[PDB]
Amino acid sequence: GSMERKRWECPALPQGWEREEVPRRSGLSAGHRDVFYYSPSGKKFRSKPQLARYLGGSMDLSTFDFRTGKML
């Protein structure tokens, strides 16, 4: 497949959120993998602080792993 993208759900976040991994392929910027998160409204965001600030009141994600998308 072209532009293959992964899609793993993150139980740490409220039902409706999902995670996705995309492999870069731009000259030296290749090999690098970027992770994007999507909310129930389909909002695309890529920032740890935004995940905690957004779901802050809903819950604490300070101990959430953004690189691995896992709760530790």
Task: Give the domain CATH number at 23.
Answer: 3.30.890.10
> For 49, how many CA atoms within 13 A lie in the half-sphere containing its CB?
0
**Experiment type:** NMR
Question: How many domains does the chain divide into?
Answer: 1
Q: What is the largest CA-CA distance in the chain?
A: 41
Bin 66: left if φ > 0, else alpha if -120 < ψ < 50, else beta.
Answer: alpha
Tally Cβ neighbours within 10 Å of residue 22.
14
Q: What is the C-alpha separation between 23 and 32, in angstroms, rounded?
A: 6
Q: How far apart are CA 72 and CA 37, in angstroms?
A: 18
| Domain around 2 | 1-72
- Quick check: helix, strand or coil at residue 64? strand
Length of the chain in terms of residues written: 72
Task: Tell me phi and psi for residue 69, to 5 degrees.
Answer: 65, 40
Instruction: Give me the residue label for tokens 């959430």.
Output: 64
